[PDB]
Design a protein around this nucleic acid. Structure first.
Ligand SMILES: [Mg+2]
Ligand SMILES: [Zn+2]
Ligand SMILES: [Zn+2]
Ligand SMILES: [Zn+2]
Lengths: 51, 49, 97, 263, 45, 66, 48, 44, 144
RNA sequence: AGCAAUAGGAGCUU
């Protein structure tokens, strides 16, 4: 398994680590339940792709 | 840089309306009034002031 | 900067010579600029976000030039249509009616 | 010649009819009670440990907005006319608040009743936060979870509502006169008829409606004024009214003093 | 030296500028300084 | 965030009424009747209590970091 | 305004704005002027 | 059976938003990307 | 994201003309349209070589040059200000030094506060970046 | 007694 690179992950998508973790653990992970995702985190900055 | 350029001794802020000002009066904030300045040559009529 | 100093006051865009006029200073608190309401027509200004620029003349020749050529009272009548450009507006008109 | 007719009188509000006075007098009284009657309110907050979710100036604003008993505040001095340095005992009231949540379930509410008066110019009856009853819990100040703590030292001082609304003894001073528009001081907007489309004043039955045969009177001035003072519990309604009158009296006496001693 | 705190496990401790940045109890990666000791005044306005 | 102490417009103290308002709402009473019993008669005071959104409950759910 | 400008000069014409503004603003402060939803409503016959 | 009212329409719309939310296009696009697009680009 | 204000539509005193608007000072005093503001400054240490790196530290005048015109008297011994401290404009909140390549051999790279803003320090964070060098985030707070 | 540049993007008032 050759490592070919790292792909940024869209928050609240099926590959995000927040997709599971119903509200209690979301609160424990410092994540707002109202936050809907749909963006990326690059160097700690939230980025959204404009259609 | 030649037809137009940036200049010193200028200010900018939001404008407001004042029914109690005269037509040729402008109300200047205190902070801007202290930041901006006018050079006044000292003479024998304005030395005390 | 002190009371009655002539300063050039200006709003962009400066479409005609009466968009930039010389005003007498009155020092006030509360960081906005204050304008008599009849001069908002030549500037095409209103009070919903607008900002205007103030230029301070640094010599006596420029003070005299401002006060004797660019002063607000001297621009009431315009050469564009040989009619006044400053009038009574926007509540004084309704109230005087 | 001035006359008062109280219509309703409880501790928090008094409803009264004022008569045989000029409208300027009645309006000056309304303004004085709204703006220039001194009270006591927290004017300086000292945070020791605040680990609650609320911010420090949020809590400070809320504490400053807490009504305190101000019955004896008139025998007290303004903190700008005292020789003392950092607050003494005679021109300030010092309060303490200590709150803490222990356990890992539930939320502990921090109420204004938890404020504790420590010092103050005794035995003056000032300083205590106002409670409605014996069983009142007071005002909500903050909420606390596990291990969160609030440690605050508040100072209370004398001030008026001109400087800041937290010193206002009054909430709303209802005020009206001439329910039937006999003086024609208003000119009713209408679509079809101005009499059908406008609700009656709550003091309409206190005055005779104009007769259809009546002509307009150009001698009548306003003479009866119906006003309802309400308080926040810091002062009582009769106290608010009487001290508004006294404050107005002392303002006029100050003017008279300056005039006489300007000769 | 100066007091710090973990961001994950809320542990209190104090580090002295030469050890790495870490928690004792858990070993977590992010730490926050502690509130100052001075006294802070607010105007309640 | 948390119930304001005073009414913005007139200054009546409403900060001591939020819990009573919630208790009135549990037994089924509609908002106008609850506001009537708390003796909020002016619509400024009424909209003070009627439009409050209590966000401190949401802010308190994130574990204290001390 | 044009007449006063032409006869009296720019200073008197400038002061005219202030005089009229102050008088009318005081009168309107103590008279009042508003607008409401009812000022845009015509009666039934006009609607017909 | 009775006439569908406006409130019935808002119930239907609440069902729609309960399912999809407000950013479902972003999430579904990215899920499609990571499920199929990367592998297809590798096999192009 | 708003508040239900009580609004009158009137030509009251002439100060609401041309989209101006009169607001009650007492309602402002009781908290109408009052808001918190949070500004966060960031800074980290870079590696210019083998043993040449930056350091978070209060820069003493003797060993450092080109020091900013603000005050440094608020930094602790670690070059970081503490949360809970009042800060004015031009004040330093993160002290940092960059070594002079080949006493008195250091220049400063400190981050001052913005010349316009007042406020109170809220949350001084400290961690390490992707490459293991020290990393600092400082969140300020104020009320508008 | 000394506070970089170049770009892109989003905005303010006409
Ligand atoms: Mg505009
Ligand atoms: Zn004293
Ligand atoms: Zn830890
Ligand atoms: Zn109210």
């Amino acid at each position: 398994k050759v490592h070919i690179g790292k792909v940024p992950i869209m928050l609240r998508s099926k590959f995000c680590s927040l997709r599971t973790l119903d509200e209690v653990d979301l609160y424990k992970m410092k994540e707002c339940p109202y936050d809907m995702g749909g963006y990326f985190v690059i160097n700690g900055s939230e980025k959204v792709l404009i259609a | 840089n030649l037809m137009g350029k940036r200049v010193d001794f200028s200010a900018r802020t939001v404008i407001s309306g004042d029914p109690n000002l005269e037509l040729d009066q402008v109300g200047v904030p205190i902070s801007i009034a202290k930041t901006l300045s006018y050079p006044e040559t000292v003479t024998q009529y304005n030395i005390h002031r | 900067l002190m009371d009655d100093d002539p300063v050039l006051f200006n709003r962009q865009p400066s479409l005609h010579k009466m968009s930039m006029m010389a005003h007498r200073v009155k020092v006030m608190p509360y960081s906005t600029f204050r304008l008599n309401l009849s001069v908002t027509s030549p500037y095409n200004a209103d009070f919903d976000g607008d900002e205007m620029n103030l230029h301070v003349p640094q010599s006596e020749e420029t003070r005299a030039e401002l006060s004797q050529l660019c002063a607000v009272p001297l621009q009431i009548v315009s050469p564009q249509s040989n009619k006044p450009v400053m009038g009574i507006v926007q509540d004084t008109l309704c109230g005087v009616r | 010649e001035p006359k008062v007719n109280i219509i309703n009188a409880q501790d928090d509000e008094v409803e009264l009819m004022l008569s045989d006075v000029n409208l300027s007098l009645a309006n000056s009284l309304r303004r004085t009670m709204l703006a220039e009657v001194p009270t006591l309110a927290i004017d300086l907050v000292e945070i020791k440990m605040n680990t609650s979710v609320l911010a420090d100036e949020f809590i400070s604003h809320r504490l400053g907005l807490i009504p305190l008993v101000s019955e004896d505040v008139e025998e007290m001095k303004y903190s700008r006319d005292c020789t003392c340095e950092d607050y003494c005992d005679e021109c300030s009231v010092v309060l303490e608040l200590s709150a803490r949540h222990e356990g890992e379930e539930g939320t502990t509410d921090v109420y204004s009743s938890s404020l504790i008066k420590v010092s103050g110019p005794g035995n003056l009856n000032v300083g205590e936060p106002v409670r409605r009853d014996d069983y009142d819990q007071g005002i909500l100040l903050c909420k606390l979870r596990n291990h969160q703590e609030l440690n605050i030292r508040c100072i209370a001082k004398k001030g008026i509502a001109k400087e800041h609304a937290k010193w206002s003894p009054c909430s709303a001073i209802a005020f009206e006169y001439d329910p039937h528009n006999k003086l024609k001081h208003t000119d009713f907007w209408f679509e079809v008829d101005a009499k059908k489309e406008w609700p009656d004043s709550k003091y309409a039955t206190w005055e005779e409606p104009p007769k259809p045969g009546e002509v307009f009177d150009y001698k009548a001035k306003p003479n009866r004024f119906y006003m309802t003072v309400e308080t926040t519990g810091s002062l009582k309604a009769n106290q608010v009214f009487s001290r508004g009158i006294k404050t107005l009296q002392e303002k006029l006496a100050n003017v008279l003093f300056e005039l006489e001693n300007s000769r | 030296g100066v007091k710090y705190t973990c961001g994950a496990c809320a542990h209190n401790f104090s580090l002295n500028k030469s050890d790495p940045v870490r928690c004792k109890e858990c070993g977590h990666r992010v730490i926050y300084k502690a509130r100052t000791k001075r006294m802070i005044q607010f105007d309640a306005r | 965030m948390i119930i304001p102490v005073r009414c913005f417009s007139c200054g009546k103290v409403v900060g001591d009424k939020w819990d009573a308002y919630l208790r009135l709402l549990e037994e089924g009473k509609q908002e106008g009747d609850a506001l009537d019993e708390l003796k909020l008669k002016r619509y400024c005071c009424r909209r003070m209590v009627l439009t409050h959104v209590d966000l401190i409950e949401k802010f308190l759910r994130y574990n204290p970091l001390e | 305004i044009h007449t006063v400008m032409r006869e009296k000069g720019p200073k008197i014409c400038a002061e005219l704005f202030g005089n009229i503004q102050k008088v009318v603003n005081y009168w309107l402060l103590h008279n009042g002027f508003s607008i409401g939803i009812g000022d845009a409503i015509a009666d039934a016959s006009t609607m017909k | 059976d009775d006439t569908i009212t406006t409130e019935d329409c808002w119930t239907v719309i609440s069902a729609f938003f309960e399912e999809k939310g407000l950013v479902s296009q972003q999430l579904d696009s990215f899920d499609e990307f990571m499920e199929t697009s990367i592998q297809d680009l590798v096999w192009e | 994201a708003g508040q239900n204000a009580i609004v009158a539509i009137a030509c009251y005193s002439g100060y609401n003309q041309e989209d101006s608007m009169i607001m009650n000072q007492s309602s402002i005093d009781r908290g109408l349209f009052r808001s918190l503001f949070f500004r966060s400054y960031m800074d980290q240490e870079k590696r210019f070589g083998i043993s040449i790196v930056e350091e978070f530290e209060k820069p003493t005048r003797a060993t450092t040059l080109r020091l900013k015109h603000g005050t440094y008297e608020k930094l602790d011994e670690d070059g970081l200000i503490a949360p809970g401290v009042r800060v004015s404009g031009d004040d330093i909140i993160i002290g940092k030094t960059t070594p002079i390549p080949p006493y008195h051999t250091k220049r400063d790279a400190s981050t001052p506060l913005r010349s316009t803003e007042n406020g109170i320090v809220d949350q001084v964070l400290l961690t390490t970046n992707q490459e293991g060098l020290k990393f600092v985030k400082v969140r300020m707070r104020t009320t508008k």
